[PDB]
From Swiss-Prot:
It comes from the Eukaryota. GO terms for biological process: actin filament bundle assembly; actin filament organization; adult walking behavior; auditory receptor cell stereocilium organization; detection of mechanical stimulus involved in equilibrioception; detection of mechanical stimulus involved in sensory perception of sound; homophilic cell adhesion via plasma membrane adhesion molecules; inner ear auditory receptor cell differentiation. It comes from Mus musculus (Mouse). One of its GO terms (molecular function) is calcium ion binding. The chain holds residues 925 to 1367 of 1943 of the full protein. This is Protocadherin-15.
Length: 443
C-alpha cells in the first residue's frame, strides 16, 4: 500500500436548515485510492475530525462507507453561521494512509427555504381508467424573492405519475389499476431555482411534503360464472319450485360493481310455461312446472349475471337440466348418519364427479335424496345411524342421464379409492358399505 485517498474537492459546499432533524443529508464527499482495485489498500472509508474544528464535528457526521454528510442530532443554530466540518478519508492498507478535506456548511434563515402551502396533500380520488395526463392535484410552495422547482423525491417507484416541475401540478403518467395498487404516497420536494443549479438539495419540514393518492375502483371487469356450463337434473316427481342448482358469478371489482343480478333465457316452452326461474340475487334456480312422464327429456337454457345489480356489465353461462326417475338412480349406503352426509354434500358430490369424469368427460353427479338407511323387510323400516344417499349422473354429450348399471360399475369399481377420499368427511372407520338399486325399481 502506497497511495492515499484523495478527495474530489478540497473544500465542499453544503447547506442545512437551522432546525434540521437528525440524519438530514447536507452533502456527499468522495475520495479515490490509486492502489489496486478490490483491495484493503484501495478501500476508502470516511470519518470526521475534531482536531482543527471540534464543534462542527459534534453536531455533524459522515456515513462511513457512502460519504454522505448528515446531521448527527436535531440541531438548533443561528442563521448565516458557517461550520467548517473536516472529514478524513482513510485506507485499509498497511500502514494506513489518509487525507483531510473541509465542508463549509452554511445555516439558512427559514425564509430562504421554501414552505409548502400544506404538509400533506390529500387530493380527491382518481379513476383507474383516467386517461394519461389527467390532473391528480397541485402542490405549491413559495419563499421570498426566489422561484421554485417542484419534484417527486420518493414513492413513485412504479413511474405512475409525473409533475410539472414549474407549476407543481401532478398528473397520471402510465395507466392505473385498482386491482394492482389502490393507494400511493408520493414525497414531493420544493427546492429554489438558484439551489438546483448549484446541485444542493436542502430537505426540511418546510420544503418536503407528502401527497396521498387514492385510486377509485371502476367497473372494468365483467361477471364471470364459477362454470361456463352448469348441469343439473329434476325428478319427474319434483314439487313446484324444487331447488335445482345455484349459479354464481364473480368479479375482481369491489362493492356494488361486483354484485350480481341473475336472469334466465329459456327457449319457449309449450302452454306458456317458464319451466325454470332463478332468484335474482341468490342465483338459485328452481322448478317452475311439473315433469310427469318427461323422463329423458332435457332443457338447455342460459343464465345471465349483470353486476352493479343489473345496471352494470354482464356475463353468461349455459345450463342443462335433465329429467330422470328411479330407473336412472343408484343408492349409496354409508355407515354414517344422514345429517353428516347432508352437511358435507357439496364436497362428497365433487369427489364422485371426479371419479365418474374419468369414465365420462364432464359428467355431473346429482343428488336425488339423503335419508336414514332403509333396511330389512322390503325396505320397510329405517336406521338413522346410517345413510341411504340417492344419486344419478348426467352426460353433457347426451343431455340424458347415465345408465344405472354403468353408474354402479364406475363407483363399486373404485369404492376403495372413494372411501379413502371420504375418510376426512366420514371420520375414522366411516365408509360406503354397498351401492344398490332403488327398492321401487326391482320387479
Ligand atoms: C424541469 O422541467 C423541464 C420541462 O418543462 C425539463 O426540461 C426538459 O428536460 C428534458 C429531459 O432532460 C430534455 O430532453 C428537454 O430538452 C427539456 N425540454 C424542455 C422543453 O424543457 C427539465 O428537465 C425538468 N427537470 C428539472 C429537474 O429541471
Ligand atoms: C348499492 O345498491 C343498493 C340497492 O339497489 C343501494 O342502496 C339503497 O340506496 C337508496 C337511496 O340511494 C336507499 O333508499 C336504500 O335505503 C338503499 N338500500 C340498500 C339495500 O342499501 C346502494 O346505494 C348502492 N351502493 C352504492 C355505494 O352506490
Ligand atoms: C489520516 O488518518 C490516518 C489514520 O491512520 C493517519 O495516518 C493520518 O496521519 C491522517 O490523520
Ligand atoms: C487534515 O487535517 C486533519 C486534522 O483535522 C488530519 O487528521 C488529517 O490527516 C489531515 O491533516
Ligand atoms: C479544508 O480547508 C480548511 C481551511 O479552510 C482546512 O483547515 C482543512 O484541513 C481542509 O483542508
Ligand atoms: Ca492506499
Ligand atoms: Ca383495473
Ligand atoms: Ca376495477
Ligand atoms: Ca364488475
Amino acid at each position: 500500500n502506497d497511495y492515499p485517498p484523495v478527495f474530489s474537492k478540497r473544500i465542499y459546499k453544503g447547506m442545512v436548515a437551522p432546525d434540521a432533524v437528525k440524519g438530514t443529508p447536507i452533502t456527499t464527499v468522495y475520495a479515490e485510492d490509486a492502489d489496486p482495485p478490490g483491495m484493503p489498500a484501495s478501500r476508502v472509508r470516511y470519518r470526521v475530525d475534531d482536531v482543527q474544528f471540534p464543534y462542527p464535528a459534534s453536531i455533524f457526521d459522515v456515513e462511513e462507507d457512502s460519504g454522505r454528510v448528515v446531521t448527527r442530532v436535531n440541531l438548533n443554530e443561528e442563521p448565516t453561521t458557517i461550520f467548517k466540518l473536516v472529514v478524513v478519508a482513510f485506507d485499509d492498507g498497511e500502514p494506513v494512509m489518509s487525507s483531510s478535506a473541509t465542508v463549509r456548511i452554511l445555516v439558512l434563515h427559514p425564509g430562504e427555504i421554501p414552505r409548502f402551502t400544506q404538509e400533506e396533500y390529500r387530493p380527491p380520488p382518481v379513476s383507474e381508467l383516467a386517461a394519461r395526463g389527467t390532473v391528480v392535484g397541485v402542490i405549491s410552495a413559495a419563499a421570498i424573492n426566489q422561484s421554485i422547482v417542484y419534484s417527486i423525491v420518493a414513492g413513485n417507484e412504479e413511474d405512475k405519475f409525473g409533475i410539472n416541475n414549474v407549476t407543481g401540478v401532478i398528473y397520471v403518467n402510465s395507466p392505473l389499476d385498482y386491482e394492482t395498487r389502490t393507494s400511493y404516497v408520493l414525497r414531493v420536494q420544493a427546492d429554489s431555482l438558484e439551489v438546483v443549479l448549484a446541485n444542493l438539495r436542502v430537505p426540511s419540514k418546510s420544503n418536503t411534503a407528502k401527497v396521498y393518492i387514492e385510486i377509485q375502483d371502476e367497473n372494468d371487469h365483467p361477471p364471470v360464472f364459477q362454470k361456463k356450463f352448469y348441469i343439473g337434473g329434476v325428478s319427474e316427481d319434483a314439487r313446484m319450485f324444487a331447488s335445482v342448482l345455484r349459479v354464481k358469478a364473480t368479479d375482481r371489482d369491489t362493492g356494488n360493481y361486483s354484485a350480481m343480478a341473475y336472469r334466465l333465457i329459456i327457449p319457449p316452452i309449450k302452454e306458456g310455461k317458464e319451466g325454470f326461474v332463478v332468484e335474482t340475487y341468490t342465483g338459485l334456480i328452481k322448478t317452475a312446472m311439473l315433469f310427469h312422464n318427461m323422463r329423458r327429456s332435457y332443457f338447455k337454457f342460459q343464465v345471465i349475471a349483470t353486476d352493479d345489480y343489473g345496471k352494470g356489465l354482464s356475463g353468461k353461462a349455459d345450463v342443462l337440466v335433465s329429467v330422470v326417475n328411479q330407473l336412472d338412480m343408484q343408492v349409496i349406503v354409508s355407515n354414517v348418519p344422514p345429517t353428516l352426509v347432508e352437511k358435507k354434500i357439496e364436497d362428497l358430490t365433487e369427489i364422485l364427479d371426479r371419479y365418474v369424469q374419468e369414465q365420462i368427460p364432464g359428467a355431473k353427479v346429482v343428488v336425488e335424496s339423503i335419508g336414514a338407511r332403509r333396511h330389512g323387510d322390503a325396505y320397510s323400516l329405517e336406521d338413522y345411524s346410517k345413510c341411504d344417499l340417492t344419486v344419478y349422473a348426467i352426460d353433457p354429450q347426451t343431455n340424458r342421464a347415465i345408465d344405472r348399471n354403468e353408474l354402479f360399475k364406475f363407483l363399486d369399481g373404485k369404492l376403495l379409492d372413494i372411501n379413502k377420499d371420504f375418510q376426512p368427511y366420514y371420520g375414522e372407520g366411516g365408509r360406503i358399505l354397498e351401492i344398490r338399486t332403488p327398492e321401487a325399481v326391482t320387479s
